[PDB]
Amino acid sequence: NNVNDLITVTKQTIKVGDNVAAAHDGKDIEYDTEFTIDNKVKKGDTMTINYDKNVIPSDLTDKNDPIDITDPSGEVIAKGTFDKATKQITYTFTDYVDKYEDIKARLTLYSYIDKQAVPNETSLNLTFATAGKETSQNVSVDYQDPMVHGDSNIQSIFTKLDENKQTIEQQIYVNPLKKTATNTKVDIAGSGNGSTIIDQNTEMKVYKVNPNQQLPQSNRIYDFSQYEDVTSQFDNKKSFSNNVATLDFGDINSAYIIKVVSKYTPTSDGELDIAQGTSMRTTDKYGYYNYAGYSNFIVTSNDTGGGDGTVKP
């Protein structure tokens, strides 16, 4: 029932918006395809499109369904279904293809570096496809580096956002350089004024990283089994003042990870103008306070595409 061989790819281009994937500048990856459907395609037939195995259409939301192809008027041409495992859309055809002949359709699908696939900086040959007909381009994946100010060093990104429960998750690397940090204090804040909400209840788990361990340059951990959960240690070390939590690390030599899930407030305009920040403080030689800080904010792609047909007489 797969009718891939019946599909005529007129165009297919992978772009990166230079061939550099700034995954931490929220750089997208276009795949702008066009094609022709022959009339020998009937209701219930299936053509495919697959993404590269190392991308994902949505970075921080599991809600990555494929769009559906729709004629100018709005009648549906096919409804797609995305399988994360195989990273492949399967587009089933509606009765449009029976009512209509000579059918030309365009797509444009954005995607992000799958942080589970590619935990560290590297080059990749990306391979995309439209109905089996592959195309490729080479790229390199740069991950952000931490801010350093004396001993104070930190970095962070957004990992998972839940449009349903209105929460957002941020993962913070306190002391990725495993420096000796004296009276270390780490703040998390809605930011720099406010966009989210941080208080007693905002979930903050803390993990210690042994000196032999190296963290994923993606800045997204997937497995916390293999890190010392120290969250209870920080029980008696939490100050909360004006959308700002403050953590008292004391003198440290070890890296740490913080997992912050925080409620956000929806924007009336109906876009996701969300942002959150952290900052690491350490006393320096001269007895001053050095602040390195990090702030993340959400970026949005959105697939687009339609079709068109002769009306059969």
Partner: peptide
């Protein structure tokens, strides 16, 4: 259809006197 960005800000804080 959704991903993050990162930004950096540094200051120092001493005592005026």
């Amino acid at each position: 259809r959704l991903s993050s960005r990162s930004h950096t800000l540094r200051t120092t804080c001493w005592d005026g006197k």
